[PDB]
Symmetry: D3
Subunit: 72 residues, 6 copies
């Protein structure tokens, strides 16, 4: 279910650290080249949405969480 909560373990946190640190560094380097304005701001908001899905893919990877809390 889209509503499930994955209780991530350290392996999940480690994977998330790798992906977020990697994207953070790349995003800072790209943002430094872009002029302030609407397109730069939309790039940032679209990138934040993308990262919810990358983070969820890591958090729910077999071995990266200990238990799932389900609702209903």
């Amino acid at each position: 279910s889209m509503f499930d909560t994955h209780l991530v373990n350290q392996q999940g946190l480690d994977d998330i650290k790798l992906i977020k640190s990697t994207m953070q560094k790349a995003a800072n380097e790209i943002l430094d080249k872009l002029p302030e304005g609407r397109e730069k701001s939309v790039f940032k908001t679209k990138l934040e949405e993308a990262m919810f899905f990358a983070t969820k893919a890591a958090a729910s990877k077999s071995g990266n969480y200990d238990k799932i809390i389900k609702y209903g």
Copy 2:
């Protein structure tokens, strides 16, 4: 207008090369950590959307294009 076409010059192409190669390296490193599945696929599609805005920000940066083609 959202419909304007910026004819990029070499400085725009150089900026776009920097931003796209930076994101391609980061995306490949992140994708290598993610399990095959829907979330990985949505990450990629959201990231493609984000990059249209980063690329447009670079292409229309003052000094990065020579002329704008306008319609209507």
Copy 3:
């Protein structure tokens, strides 16, 4: 891209918000015919829930730790 590690209060707020939407989603989905529009509804709803869950998890009082990168 901060990560918020929720405390018990954050977990309980997330229980409330996710339980509330899951119940409403079940009732609505059971009324909708199968097909493209029902699928897209679920896609958009999941996107909404990422933002609601982040709002709850990053609310002051709801996290033990913020991890920055």
Copy 4:
């Protein structure tokens, strides 16, 4: 871009699904702090409900007419 002209059952289904989502949204919103994430939750939910409402409106038996262009 079909235009659905719903009949009485279509209006009833849409009333149920929108009433159900409005109640759940209100309960969730009361738990969320003001800010960007809460605002995006609302906008995503509005997108979701366009598709749920289209699904209901074009359900067999729920329309007087579907106008095509």
Copy 5:
């Protein structure tokens, strides 16, 4: 999630905006190769038209009833 039950004037405006966009979309689609970008163009356009149609339906004079 307000509902607008349009009157004839709202239905006429909606016919004009949707007919206009459908004609333009068909002309553009006839130029585009099959594939992912063409498919996403269509779904993005459907999303856009939900908002255009709601703007027209809630225009003063275009609705007979608002249901809350």
Copy 6:
């Protein structure tokens, strides 16, 4: 994130698609009241056009060069 450098045929296809949508969009916008829905229509339409323009620029026979990264 390949970059397509259009040739003349790609530029002329882009002229056709962008001038067609700009005229339609102007006609529609002139019917719409100012407000949030009109604003989101424009934002969603811009997103649509990135994909249509990319589809045209990478169509076989419409590009001089593809830059890969």
